[PDB]
Design a protein around this motif. Sequence first.
Motif, PDB file in Angstrom:
ATOM      1  N   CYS A   1       0.819  -1.207   0.000  1.00  0.00           N
ATOM      2  CA  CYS A   1       0.000   0.000   0.000  1.00  0.00           C
ATOM      3  C   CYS A   1       0.855   1.260   0.000  1.00  0.00           C
ATOM      4  CB  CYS A   1      -0.942  -0.008   1.207  1.00  0.00           C
ATOM      5  SG  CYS A   1      -2.388   1.090   1.037  1.00  0.00           S
ATOM      6  N   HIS A   2       2.159   1.068   0.092  1.00  0.00           N
ATOM      7  CA  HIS A   2       3.109   2.178   0.099  1.00  0.00           C
ATOM      8  C   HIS A   2       4.439   1.752  -0.508  1.00  0.00           C
ATOM      9  CE1 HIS A   2       0.525   4.105   3.360  1.00  0.00           C
ATOM     10  NE2 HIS A   2       0.693   5.076   2.486  1.00  0.00           N
ATOM     11  N   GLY A   3       4.391   0.765  -1.397  1.00  0.00           N
ATOM     12  CA  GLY A   3       5.605   0.268  -2.032  1.00  0.00           C
ATOM     13  C   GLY A   3       6.474  -0.548  -1.089  1.00  0.00           C
ATOM     14  N   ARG A   4       6.062  -0.616   0.167  1.00  0.00           N
ATOM     15  CA  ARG A   4       6.787  -1.350   1.190  1.00  0.00           C
ATOM     16  C   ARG A   4       5.850  -2.374   1.817  1.00  0.00           C
ATOM     17  NH1 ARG A   4       7.334   4.090   4.821  1.00  0.00           N
ATOM     18  NH2 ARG A   4       8.609   4.539   2.967  1.00  0.00           N
ATOM     19  N   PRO A   5       6.390  -3.402   2.504  1.00  0.00           N
ATOM     20  CA  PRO A   5       5.581  -4.420   3.193  1.00  0.00           C
ATOM     21  C   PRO A   5       4.620  -3.815   4.213  1.00  0.00           C
ATOM     22  CG  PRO A   5       7.882  -4.515   3.886  1.00  0.00           C
ATOM     23  CD  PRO A   5       7.826  -3.676   2.644  1.00  0.00           C
ATOM     24  N   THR A   6       3.470  -3.384   3.729  1.00  0.00           N
ATOM     25  CA  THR A   6       2.468  -2.764   4.563  1.00  0.00           C
ATOM     26  C   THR A   6       1.576  -3.815   5.205  1.00  0.00           C
ATOM     27  OG1 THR A   6       1.163  -2.433   2.536  1.00  0.00           O
ATOM     28  CG2 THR A   6       2.406  -0.540   3.387  1.00  0.00           C
ATOM     29  N   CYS A   7       1.780  -4.038   6.488  1.00  0.00           N
ATOM     30  CA  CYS A   7       1.011  -5.024   7.226  1.00  0.00           C
ATOM     31  C   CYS A   7       0.403  -4.407   8.482  1.00  0.00           C
ATOM     32  CB  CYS A   7       1.909  -6.208   7.595  1.00  0.00           C
ATOM     33  SG  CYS A   7       3.429  -5.747   8.496  1.00  0.00           S
ATOM     34  N   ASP A   8      -0.910  -4.546   8.638  1.00  0.00           N
ATOM     35  CA  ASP A   8      -1.589  -4.029   9.824  1.00  0.00           C
ATOM     36  C   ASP A   8      -1.879  -5.146  10.814  1.00  0.00           C
ATOM     37  OD1 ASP A   8      -2.300  -1.030   9.597  1.00  0.00           O
ATOM     38  OD2 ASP A   8      -2.848  -1.799   7.622  1.00  0.00           O
ATOM     39  N   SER A   9      -0.850  -5.947  11.070  1.00  0.00           N
ATOM     40  CA  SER A   9      -0.885  -7.039  12.036  1.00  0.00           C
ATOM     41  C   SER A   9       0.363  -7.886  11.850  1.00  0.00           C
ATOM     42  CB  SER A   9      -2.139  -7.908  11.879  1.00  0.00           C
ATOM     43  OG  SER A   9      -2.282  -8.367  10.549  1.00  0.00           O
ATOM     44  N   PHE A  10       0.530  -8.910  12.665  1.00  0.00           N
ATOM     45  CA  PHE A  10       1.709  -9.750  12.577  1.00  0.00           C
ATOM     46  C   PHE A  10       1.470 -10.893  11.604  1.00  0.00           C
ATOM     47  CE2 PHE A  10       1.476  -8.007  16.907  1.00  0.00           C
ATOM     48  CZ  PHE A  10       2.621  -7.236  16.890  1.00  0.00           C
TER      49      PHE A  10
END
Length: 25
Positions: free
Chosen positions: A4-13
Amino acid sequence: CPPCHGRPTCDSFTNCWELLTCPPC
């Protein structure tokens, strides 16, 4: 559904190592 930002965008583990499926954008 790519990072979502060109980077590993994770909203949790668990989804952070499941970024292969669908990154939460």
